[PDB]
Symmetry: T
């Protein structure tokens, strides 16, 4: 398993949670960090757990970023199915 | 900004292009590698260029990962609009 | 005096505490990640802090993993005593 | 920016969970935090971490408290210079 | 495993553009390709690279062609072992 | 499955075997190195093999580290049984 | 690691050849990625191969860079002669 | 951790050779310097780099000199906390 | 050159200590050995490892024994190409 | 990138301290200098190093002087392009 | 510290298995050994590795034999300086 | 040919020269850093240049490190002689 990638992806969501909704540029950067780490996870449950946690942060982000949060969670779910 | 990430991501699409449509497992791993590298690209044009090249690969991938390719391209395009 | 190993180990316990009890597989993987980082810590108070924080997560993990949580924390205290 | 902001943010959360008596480890986490916050290059995140760093000054040892105050002041100065 | 397939596939495309007289550079790209191909845990990727490697036998030096042949036979044996 | 971690961990036991029983800090440091590499082994036989080799070295380690060696080998076994 | 540098330099030219002539920013970044890898090549045939391939890409690059491509291929030739 | 002392020393030498008008480049080297100096455990090194950082204050841009001043006092307090 | 000989030599020592039944672990160590032995530009070292690898052939699984022999033959061909 | 300016600046400092006869080492430090100077995204950094690189040309070997020259011209065109 | 002792110990193990004729590889492993032995910081580890290095002097070339004796002498001097 | 190790070794002697003769623990650390890099140089001119430079630092270092500085310079000259 790529547990280190799950650790870094989980920590990206924790810092993304504590950012104000106005810091759109830092939110966008952490999602790029989160996705890059999540795309290396070979565990289905890990991808789905991060997908449901990412969806929980969608109310905590800018509306422009919320669309990314949705499409990113959709990718992790599709990546879990394809594994 | 991150041209080395653009190099690895572009090389991922070229190796993906040479894969047979039945090598679903290997195609899926290069997509995970491509998205991991493309997530670190801060140039809007480079993301859109790679997104278009990824969409041209949809007919050559396995039909069970073609949706993932389609969403990965939309993932990159939405990234370019957000940067 | 590591410091950075304490950060990765502490982050591993935070990700471990957020997992459901049914994800023994991610729990086992994060423990292996946590132990790999906790083993590189040359600070006695840090080893005891992580060991205590690890013992608190025993009720929230699967009973098959709980014996690993017990031995992991027990070893961190032995390592702290050896320093 | 993003990768440095993660480890710096994670350094503050581990620092908050330390007891006020583990001074040697508290000092080491701020050295790890300042080494990572010094590579961010963003104004808003530097001010976000500097504000979070100030909130941990009561939870820190009295000797480290002046280090925490001076570290948060420099992240503000670093943010203004950018 | 995928990143090893990337560098191994890129080494073959670079080896393909090399002239037959660049024997020193052909040997080094094969050392590079093998070093990466030995970390591929995918049976299909090894069989593909091995077949691509054998298509390069006429374009490489005759001294290298034996190395090309033995390297392809290794990838098949590694593939069958998986 | 990462044989690279098995190589470092196996090399740690060989250097640990060549140390005198008095080199307490050298033994303790090699064991912290051994465990950090052993926790990243995802093979059942590799963990059980190194755990068996670790118990064979307990007569050669310092009395202070003997209990740590004892629990380190028990950790690797409890690992492989959960893998 | 002479051969690894040649791999990344050759991959840099192939990605540069696939870029549109308007992507001056990407073409620039790839040139710097190419030269950074080309400076680490100690093979005379390798430098002359990449220098002639880089010359072939000069009409395909943004006009602002065609001068920079010319001096880069010039530099790689002067390196091969000095080796 | 003398490896970090080497880079932090090299950062001050590059900072000393910059023109006073290279504000952005000065700011980057100080960000690099503090990232390396924050990993130093030796007391004499933190004080030597702090006294060398203060000697460069007349050579930096007038914005950044305050940041240089606080970065030096930061290294003074770290050496004290050790 | 030397650091790859160290890892390759260390791989054979760990491979020789493996039981004949640990097929998956034997295969991974040869994947590790060959990856390191494929960046050794020393003729004496390649022949040393090739002879040392041939002696491990009775110790390994029958299917790995074929991979062991093909591996020794590659290093000899590498040594002759250098 | 500030880290690349630091390594490139250190390359020029060592290059300036070499004797005029050390052709092989002067050539190697230039390859090291350029490999780091290529990854610099600051105009003032590239022109600063190109200025210092031109000041080293009288002290290097005549064969190396042609590379020192074209490397300074590269960094100027590089700063113009950014 | 412990990882440096590991590679240094592994360097002596591979050095002991080398024939007295592979001088370029014996020389390279010694430079690999000293590169790792310089960053150990443990007085016992330096003296133990210096002893094992001395015991390899009969199995190495007379040219490398003087490198072996001076490398062991320095590890002994380094252990006293700690 | 590792000119990078020459850069790190040259920078080590510059920082060593700027140290006072009293910070023995820091001077000794830079000797260890310098030696670790100087071993992997491989250039006969560079080893003799750093050896001659290192000799010029021997009167400036602490009296205990001077015997180590002397033997360190004799090693680099023996390395360049064996090259």
């Amino acid at each position: 398993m790529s547990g280190d990638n799950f650790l870094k992806a989980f920590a990206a969501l924790e810092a993304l949670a504590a950012l104000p909704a106005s810091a759109k540029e830092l939110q966008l950067e952490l999602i790029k960090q989160f996705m890059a780490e999540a795309m290396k996870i070979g565990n289905k449950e890990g991808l789905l757990l991060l997908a449901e946690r990412l969806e929980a942060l969608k109310p905590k982000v800018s509306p422009e970023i919320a669309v990314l949060v949705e499409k990113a969670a959709e990718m992790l779910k599709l990546l879990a199915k394809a594994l």
